[PDB]
Amino acid sequence: EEIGWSYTGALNQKNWGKKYPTCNSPKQSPINIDEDLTQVNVNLKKLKFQGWDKTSLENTFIHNTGKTVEINLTNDYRVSGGVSEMVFKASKITFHWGKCNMSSDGSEHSLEGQKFPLEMQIYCFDADRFSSFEEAVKGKGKLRALSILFEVGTEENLDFKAIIDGVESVSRFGKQAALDPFILLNLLPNSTDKYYIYNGSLTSPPCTDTVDWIVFKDTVSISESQLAVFCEVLTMQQSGYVMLMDYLQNNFREQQYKFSRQVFSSYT
Structure with missing residues (x-):
């Protein structure tokens, strides 16, 4: 189907644009955000979460794609706010x-x-317009993503226990496993009223240019032993003329120029 890419190996991120032209647009993610360089905007709509405090459904799977560990959500998790009151799933x-x-x-x-040391990203689309996130991407619909940044603390973050167990369960390339019950709202930072928002994109091919990003100011802390499980995840990479298995590490895109984009900041 779709042509294979890597971050720094074969078809590396500098060369994604040769096959995926949108990766060369001026609205790419991720970026650096400096507070004093943002525009505080009181008009921003407070973030609204619907169904996030409910237990995750039994058919929620985590999946090692070789580029990340992906959680395919099943609940009716709805979210709105920031630049609009439109509800996303x-x-x-x-x-x-x-x-x-x-x-x-x-x-x-x-x-x-x-x-x-770690970033979690939650992807959302307009469920009225599209049947699935993949369809939304394929159709260039409006996308919304939330970015949660992590610091290593002294203690085990119990809100993440189910997630961490799941990552352990899918170290093997391509593996899928059902997640123990977890609460999506508890994965967010303590307070969510402080956030940034900007116009950007998916951070890997096809690099679709239609994502409004919400990046929370406050961090989530996990312990060193929780963070460690991610570097046990396995992947496949083309190295020269040889296909090899290795640990999945440094799976992030380098930062992009803002190119006149403004970053907006909530007011608290």
């Missing part, structure tokens, strides 16, 4: 990490030039 969660220690940079977005 949250359908996918992906993770980006480095070498998985407290001092490693693995996030895609950064704040104040600081990268983080």
Whole structure:
């Protein structure tokens, strides 16, 4: 089907545009966000979560795609706010990490030039217009994504126990496993009223240019042992004329120029 890509190997990120032309547009993600360079906007609509405090359904799977571990959400998770009151449906969660220690940079977005050891991204689309997130992407519909940045703390973050167990379960390339019950709202930072928003894109091919990003100012903390499980995930990579298996590490796109884009900031 779709042509294989990598971050720094074969068809690396500098060359994605040769096959996926949108990857060369001026509205690409991720970016760095500096607070003093943003525009505070009181007009922004407070974030509204519907169904996020409910238990995750039994058919919620995590999946090792070789580029990330993806969670395919099943509940009717609805979200709105920021630049509009239009309701989106949250359908996918992906993770980006480095070498998985407290001092490693693995996030895609950064704040104040600081990268983080882990980033979680939750993807959403307009369920009225489209039947699935993939269809929305294929049709260039309006997309919304939320970025959650992580720091390593001293203690085990119990809200993530089910997720972490799931990542352990899919170390093997391509593997899928059902997730133990979890609560999606509990995966977000303590307070969500402080956030940034900008016009951007998917951070990997096809790099679709129609994503409004919400990036939370506050971080989520997990322990060192929780972060460690991500670097046990396995992938396949073409290295020269040989196809090899390796640990999945540094699975993030480098940062992009803003090109006149404005970053908006909530007011609290």
